[PDB]
Nucleic acid binder design. Sequence first.
RNA 1: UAGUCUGGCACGGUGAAGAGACAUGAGAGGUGUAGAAUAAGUGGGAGGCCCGGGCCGCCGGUGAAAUACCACUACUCUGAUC
RNA 2: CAUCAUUCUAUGGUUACCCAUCAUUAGAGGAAAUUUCCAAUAAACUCUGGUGUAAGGCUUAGAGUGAUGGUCGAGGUGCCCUAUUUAGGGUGAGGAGCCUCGGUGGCAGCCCCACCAAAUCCUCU
Lengths: 75, 212
Amino acid sequence: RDKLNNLVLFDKATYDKLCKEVPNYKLITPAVVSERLKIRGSLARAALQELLSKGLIKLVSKHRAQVIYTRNTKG
Amino acid sequence: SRDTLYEAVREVLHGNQRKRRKFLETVELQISLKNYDPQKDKRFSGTVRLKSTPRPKFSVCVLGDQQHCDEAKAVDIPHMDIEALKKLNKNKKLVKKLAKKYDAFLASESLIKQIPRILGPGLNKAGKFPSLLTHNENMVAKVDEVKSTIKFQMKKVLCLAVAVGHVKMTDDELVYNIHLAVNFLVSLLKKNWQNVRALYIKSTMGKPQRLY
RNA sequence: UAGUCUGGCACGGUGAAGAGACAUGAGAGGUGUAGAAUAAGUGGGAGGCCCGGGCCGCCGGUGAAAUACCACUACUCUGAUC
RNA sequence: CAUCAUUCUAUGGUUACCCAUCAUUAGAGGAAAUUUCCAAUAAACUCUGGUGUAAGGCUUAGAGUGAUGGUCGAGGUGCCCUAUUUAGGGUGAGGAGCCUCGGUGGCAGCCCCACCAAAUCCUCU
């Protein structure tokens, strides 16, 4: 029906709308990102452990199907 | 159309019982009409002639590049340059003012053209119709529309209103602008026939009086 | 074409009730964004009006017309009948 | 580049008179359906010059400018069947004709997403 056209890698502004505003979301999941920021879903699985290696987000429980993160702590 | 009561042409000097007001008044004559269509090819158009010094006062403008250099300074012409009619039409839609502030324009000869560019036919649907002639004569040719004929119009409200004389000239000059006005409704007569039903001779500001 | 069916005119009237006109004699009536305002319009217009004093306005601002200041035709209906 | 408007030029056009729609006069025009086709049906709707008046630069050659070296964004509007009627069940075709940076809901605004619409009708079935 309504076919959608996504993108392989980031635009410069879209990473500034990812790296600032995805840590303002609570469900940081690769299914949230590729519906919202509209990318090739495979990408969003890889981007989130670079942010863990950057040290923003919290790996609650990683799985094959769904990897679940949340925004920054309170303390 | 024809009526006439021109056997007792006096009793117009009755001044101080109607007149007691101080501003400059214009004797503006309403006449009663009936049975005319505003929609159709039915016209009530033309300019009724008045040679006997009416002298209409309004927002006056005069142009002309002739031997009117000194002939037009008798009245003190506000002669803005032929070049300087630019913002006359430009400060109209971009700016929200009437950039004219004058209720007449002029067509002249010696040069056959006045202006056929965006400024001339820019006035073509503004009103205040530039029609008058001052071509080749030069006797005065400045006040010879003012001291000459009056204009009127037709529209969708079926009523007529136009000036006949002015307050500076006396009641014996306001009687010279009655006879030579409605005698041009018996000469000018298509078969929109018997248009004049009742006549209201008046001051500017007073009470209704009848000549029929 | 006789006849016959039919409409008009004529002889050919009277009175009332009625429905619509016209001739009329008063009211009420008007909503585009917008400008402070249900912009009915024409020739207007920066002045006049009353108690020297004071008023609505000009212009700005909506928009070919803009409010006080002589008049009158229309147009939506009501509406008295020699 | 194809374009509407802006300022500097305009021997350029007619003042009881010129624009763009609407109101009307004489012209040029079908896919689906239908099933296997064909030539036809029968117009919806679009414009050419005629003419009219409540808003207004007509147009015109052309130097500098609002704004895409791709432009506007482009997602909604209908008809038919039902006692799920604040809702449920259908899907043929082709022209036309319009709003907004819409208000309220969610990982609250922007992106994603949900709903309520600004005016929708004509036609061959």
